[PDB]
Amino acid sequence: VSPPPPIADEPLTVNTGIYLIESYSLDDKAETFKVNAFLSLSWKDRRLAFDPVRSGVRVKTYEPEAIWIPEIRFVNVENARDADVVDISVSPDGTVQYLERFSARVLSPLDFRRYPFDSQTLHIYLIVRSCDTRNIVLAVDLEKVGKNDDVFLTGWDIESFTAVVKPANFALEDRLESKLDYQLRISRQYFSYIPNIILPMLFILFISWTAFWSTSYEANVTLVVSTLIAHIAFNILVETNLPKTPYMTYTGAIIFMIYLFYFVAVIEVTVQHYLKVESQPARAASITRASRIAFPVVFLLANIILAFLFF
Amino acid sequence: VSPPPPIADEPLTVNTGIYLIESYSLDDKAETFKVNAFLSLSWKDRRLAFDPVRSGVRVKTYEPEAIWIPEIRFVNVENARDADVVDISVSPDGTVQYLERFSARVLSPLDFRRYPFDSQTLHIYLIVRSCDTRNIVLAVDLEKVGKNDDVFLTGWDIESFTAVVKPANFALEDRLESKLDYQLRISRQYFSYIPNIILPMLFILFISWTAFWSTSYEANVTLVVSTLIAHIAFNILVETNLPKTPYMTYTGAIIFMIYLFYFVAVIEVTVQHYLKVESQPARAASITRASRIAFPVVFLLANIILAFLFF
Amino acid sequence: VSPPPPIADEPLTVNTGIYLIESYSLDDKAETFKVNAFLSLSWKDRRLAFDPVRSGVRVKTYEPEAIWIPEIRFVNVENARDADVVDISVSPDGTVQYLERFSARVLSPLDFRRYPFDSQTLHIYLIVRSCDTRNIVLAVDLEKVGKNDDVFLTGWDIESFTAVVKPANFALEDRLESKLDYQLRISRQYFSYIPNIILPMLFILFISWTAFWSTSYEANVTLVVSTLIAHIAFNILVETNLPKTPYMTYTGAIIFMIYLFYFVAVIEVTVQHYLKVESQPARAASITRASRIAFPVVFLLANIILAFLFF
Amino acid sequence: VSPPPPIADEPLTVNTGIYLIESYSLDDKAETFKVNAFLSLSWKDRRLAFDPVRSGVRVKTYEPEAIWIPEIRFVNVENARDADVVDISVSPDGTVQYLERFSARVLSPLDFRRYPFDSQTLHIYLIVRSCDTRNIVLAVDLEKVGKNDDVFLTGWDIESFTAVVKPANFALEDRLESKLDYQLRISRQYFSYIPNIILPMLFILFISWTAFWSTSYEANVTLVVSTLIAHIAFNILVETNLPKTPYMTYTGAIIFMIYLFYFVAVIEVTVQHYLKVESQPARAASITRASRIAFPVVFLLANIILAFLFF
Amino acid sequence: VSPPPPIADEPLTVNTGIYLIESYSLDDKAETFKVNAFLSLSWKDRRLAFDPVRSGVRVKTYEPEAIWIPEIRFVNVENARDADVVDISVSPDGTVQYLERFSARVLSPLDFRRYPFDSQTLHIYLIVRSCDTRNIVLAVDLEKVGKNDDVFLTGWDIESFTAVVKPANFALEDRLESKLDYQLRISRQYFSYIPNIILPMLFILFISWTAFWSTSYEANVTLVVSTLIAHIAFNILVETNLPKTPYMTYTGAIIFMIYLFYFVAVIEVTVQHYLKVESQPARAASITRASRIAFPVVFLLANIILAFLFF
Ligand SMILES: CCCCCCCCCCCCO[C@@H]1O[C@H](CO)[C@@H](O[C@H]2O[C@H](CO)[C@@H](O)[C@H](O)[C@H]2O)[C@H](O)[C@H]1O
Ligand SMILES: CCCCCCCCCCCCO[C@@H]1O[C@H](CO)[C@@H](O[C@H]2O[C@H](CO)[C@@H](O)[C@H](O)[C@H]2O)[C@H](O)[C@H]1O
Ligand SMILES: CCCCCCCCCCCCO[C@@H]1O[C@H](CO)[C@@H](O[C@H]2O[C@H](CO)[C@@H](O)[C@H](O)[C@H]2O)[C@H](O)[C@H]1O
Ligand SMILES: *Cc1c(C)c(=O)n2c(=O)c(C)c(C)n12
Ligand SMILES: *Cc1c(C)c(=O)n2c(=O)c(C)c(C)n12
Ligand SMILES: [Br-]
Ligand SMILES: [Br-]
Ligand SMILES: [Br-]
Ligand SMILES: [Br-]
Ligand SMILES: [Br-]
Ligand code: NA
Ligand code: NA
Ligand code: NA
Ligand code: NA
């Protein structure tokens, strides 16, 4: 058991293919997903070749220990894949067809800038380290790349599973390394965010705006402050589903902006109350009247400016 | 070892059975369940046939490594079954009788549209990959498919555990696979949702309707804003027990509709105050007297419309 | 290695014993507990008998692989017993003495009807599948059943640890099975529930009843609505410590009933206000006075009936 | 492999030593802690003795399997010590010196009566079961019992790490067991409980006492009920850090006593209003004037009583 | 297997290298992180010398079991380094080049004094115990120490990953120990804390300050008491993300000091009302007008003092 020697000075080509059986547990905070797939490996080992006419047998089956198998590891896995060899088949010309079913927790970063209207490119990097004798290079067997029809990822729409055919051949620790980029394209199912977070968040805001058709300070203070407490509950709820990002997200931007609206609604209610008491209810009346228009208008404009800057 | 060779060109039939010992951890969010069971496998191996006279035994026992055992895998498992071999019995005619105990975390999707009055079909998919030498096909021994009477799933009623006798034969990575479907039929114990969520949620909503028999804006603002906040707490409570769906759930639809009632109630409470300050209490009294009948009637009709759409 | 042959037509008796070293992590929601114990097994293997006079030795020690050891399993375990053999000692007459230390996560159902004044009988089921050669039956050596004095289950009182001596012998999948039931009797330490849940829930209820000595609607609405919010927090807290049950638990019934009290207090506070505005304070004052007695009287009588129906 | 035979009838002495490398994860609810340490064992096995002159080596190194090593176990571990043998050295006189690196999750009860001003004695119980051939006894080599200087336990001060030199020899299932007690003495770092829980809790209590300088029932009902609701939040927060105990903790006692204050303050607030409504504001004023002193005085006294009964 | 012999009285030098592939799960409460890296080891074993002309090959490849490998361990790991040998390469002079891929949960203490504007120096300690035969000493091959350009730590910026080349050679349990210190430098991405915690906390504080432009006690009590409860919820939120420290953190100091502001504001609100009721509103007016400046000014200066004391 050693690497097959080169006929010419060319490197050994290991043809690879990942076929997803199950995809599950997409954790946003962890920036990880779990997977259950087939890993297909194919290379030519002439030392294994045989005569089809003399032998009579079309294909030969070997055990992993018996023959040389390349060390294909995963770059971005949390804990090293639970592998189980399914098949090793040699053709008369010495072409080896390897197949293992594995499962791995893959650490792939996410871009939350457009959350919950985001799309992500999940990655699964395959790698091979070349030895002192000869270089090993990875290739994509597009016939052996894919995903089973039923494959679902709770909370997401699965768009594609395609590998980048050209490997990344680079030298790390004075040895050649061949890296392949498999890509799982997914788009988030935003539907639930509308009845459970967005619409409730807007209702409570519109309720704070009924203070603009009220002269009762005590009621207004109750309106604006109670609803601001329910806004904090939602901000908190939202941030528990997401990691701490060094940029603003879309929901994050709306949520923050709404705080300023509360602060101003509070100011307005204070000003209105101060003018009444100072016996200026007509000046106060003019400010509430403008506020009935300004507050929903400036809200609608600011939300457009945001949607534009994010999409 | 190699698979038993065919007499003619027939496929190799492996009779299967699953016997549930324990069922536990139905996790709605992750759409999984844990299982503890027996797995029975049976197949003819002529190379193992023996004469009972010159052996003095009706059956022979073997170690898994001693004979050929079919590579039977599970399709929908989070982590590959923890398996232990119990018994291996070879009859005189060469009929092998395998038995193992396994435990696995199974990934099977759920339909939350009628939550929490829903039923589910839990699947356990058994599979076998065919060989170049010969094609392997799965079968169901109906006398070896069951569950003991003690088997319980916390918060669920276990209805049935049956298998779809006809395997789905198809090609995968240029080899024939034979897939079997074991179906565990469960229905949710909705009981607890009534005194813990449904009724508490209705009581706080009815409590907001007492504002229709009150002339006090300050009081009304307290009644409608404080109950709206307890409703937000139930919305959050409910959505913790469930995953994000691209569809509306039954509970979720009731929960959403109830926010509209709070919004309209705030409007009526607002309108009534405005009219009373404008020295139009007679108009306001008409709106409030109407609301007293309108709010319970519209609620009662809307719930009939929803129960009908969902069931 | 093969099972010992019978002298008469009799089955092989494997004498069992479980000695608890540690008990921990009783999870009410999961309906599981963890244990660390000794599993003692004893049977006669004539093939191992020897002469004490000539051998000089009393006992002969073996490694597990050297001799035949019966296949004893646990029916109700989530994560399979992590075993390590401590001793195998053979007496001159061939009586084998097996002793292993194991740890398992046992799945035993719990009856929450009387929570938090509940008592449970946790079970550990030992099992053995009989061979085609001969039948194996389990038995209890009471001399090797018990527990360490330092055994504690946080939040519980350990009452007893006995075994049901008569095994349950039944036919499962055309083979005989022998089942033993070890019973760990515990009673819940209700103490904490009094100063943390029960009494705080009563204080807030009584605070709602101070509205019966008040003529301020605005104040009463705050009293009953605020305390109802704190009541919900306790309902939520309580139900997070428990699994969803298809029956009413004791605390569950009390917590539910208290909602009816708040609902009726809101009705009274509403009615009293309505009359005051309708310029009928005399009738209002009559209802408020009757409510001062009616509410704590009906609460006391409702609780007596509940305590009676539960205990 | 059997134990060394007794020269005279004396039992075999195994000298033990635990040296802490890392201490982490003290879990109050689970009453566990995790440790990373060296375990050293030393015993005389004459069957291994050698002459330094003839052999030309003063030390002899063996594999665990090659010689006899005592089966030393831990009594109170959840999941059994993950051990890797570092070295086994035999001196010319046959004095075996064994060293291993282990890591275990140790179960050891905690006394919460003085929380968060408490001190704990964590135990690590080493044990040995004797043979039918001969008796085994444990000893402590005080030269090999310690901890690294950088050893820390998050939120705790490490006081000591010593062993109770005299074992606790006893009968278990008619065999001698020698048990040793290693003790890790720790005291909880209470510092952060002060700004995070104690002082916040006192501030909201003192804020409820401002109701005593207010004639406004409506404002008073707000002060006392809102602060009562924040007290429930701290009661809840605190009890999520602790297991349920059948005794009262220090913080628990203060937390409970503080509820009784809230109830009495509600009564005073209620009574004051009643008298004012009855045109008795003079009687009501004297009750409120008494309350202003009585509440802080009865509070400071009851805390003196409590600190005395707890420390 | 035993250590290679020395040519002279020199110790055996083992060259080390750690190459980070993945860094993840920085858990503040636990004071841990998870890493996935390459561990390179290099030492001379002349007993392994060979002739390339005789053997055929220029480099020999071995199985770990076939040769002596130094017992290099990690000091501060919670989860056992899940290791897998990638390559073992022996050159003609006997120079061994060992490559293993590992993953571990490193426990390294964090200083939260400047949280969330803090920086950390995470450590991975390599170690080796010396034999009686000969001493082993660790060394750093700077050419094999590093991290892949993609390495990211969610919520942190990775500054550097270098080693402290001079090992800590010391005595432990009468044997030589050689320790290496690999240091991973990180600075916390404070961005998210501003829109999610810091500014929402300031908005609610300023909302309470509107009570200085109000003569309404019932409203003011609502303003200061409601925002105080929202502050409590932030304090609870902040401390769920942090361990209990025996010192004050920066956020912790601000959070605490802000409660003193809420307490003083309540005092002023109480004073203002008392005077207004005592028929001295002019005095109240002077206290309220001063408060309008004093509260923001004392808040400004207090934060300047704090920021100066912490940074
Ligand atoms: C006045 C202000 C009051 C503030 C109110 C804020 C309410 C906050 C409610 C948080 C609910 C907790 O739930 C938050 O969301 C998702 C579930 O949806 C969690 O996700 C969790 O799901 C499951 C089930 O709960 C857990 O077993 C698992 O450990 C975790 O992955 C986040 O880890 C948690 O942080
Ligand atoms: C306006 C309304 C406001 C409503 C606010 C309600 C607040 C509710 C606070 C919930 C308290 C936190 O929730 C607490 O979480 C811990 C996990 O850390 C759970 O922990 C539990 O786990 C297992 C299940 O895995 C249980 O069998 C076990 O008894 C317990 O240890 C507690 O059962 C839950 O009570
Ligand atoms: C992972 C675990 C997650 C745990 C989640 C914890 C949830 C905590 C929810 C806290 C909800 C607090 O909700 C709080 O209730 C009070 C009850 O008086 C309500 O307060 C209401 O009454 C008071 C009078 O008593 C008024 O001052 C206030 O204006 C009014 O809104 C508020 O609407 C809200 O500030
Ligand atoms: C073809 C075949 C069968 C059925 C079998 O058991 N073995 C193996 O183990 C391999 C993977 C192959 C091929 N064969
Ligand atoms: C003496 C000895 C050794 C060799 C061993 O492993 N154990 C056991 O398992 C027993 C029963 C005895 C004694 N010891
Ligand atoms: Br891998
Ligand atoms: Br499987
Ligand atoms: Br088992
Ligand atoms: Br152990
Ligand atoms: Br290690
Ligand atoms: Na190989
Ligand atoms: Na086989
Ligand atoms: Na055996
Ligand atoms: Na080795």
Author numbering:
A (entry chain C), B (entry chain D), C (entry chain E), D (entry chain A), E (entry chain B): 5 to 315
Describing publication, verbatim:
Here, we used the proton-gated ion channel GLIC to identify the conformational changes that occur during gating in the family of pLGIC channels. GLIC has been crystallized in three conformations (called open, closed and locally-closed) and studied by molecular dynamics, normal mode analysis and EPR spectroscopy.
When the bimane is introduced at position 135 (loop B), the pH-fluorescence relationship curve shows an inverted bell-shape, starting after normalization at 0.7, decreasing down to 0.3 at pH 5–4, then increasing up to 0.6 at pH 3. To determine whether W72 has a role in the fluorescence phenotype while avoiding severe mutation-induced structural alteration that would result from the loss of W72, we solved the X-ray structure of Bimane-135 GLIC at pH 4 at 2.6 Å resolution. As the 135 side chain projects at the subunit interface, the quenching of Bimane-135 by W72 seen up to pH 4 suggests a contraction of the domains interfaces, driving the bimane moiety toward W72, although other mechanisms are possible. The bimane labeled GLIC V135C was crystallized in the same conditions as WT GLIC. As expected, the crystals were isomorphous to the previously described crystal lattice of the open receptor and belonged to space group C121 (unit-cell parameters: a = 182.034 Å, b = 134.075 Å, c = 159.945 Å, α = γ = 90.00°, β = 102.51°) with one pentamer in the asymmetric unit. As the covalent link between the bimane and the cysteine side chain is non-standard, its description was defined in an additional library and incorporated in the pdb file.
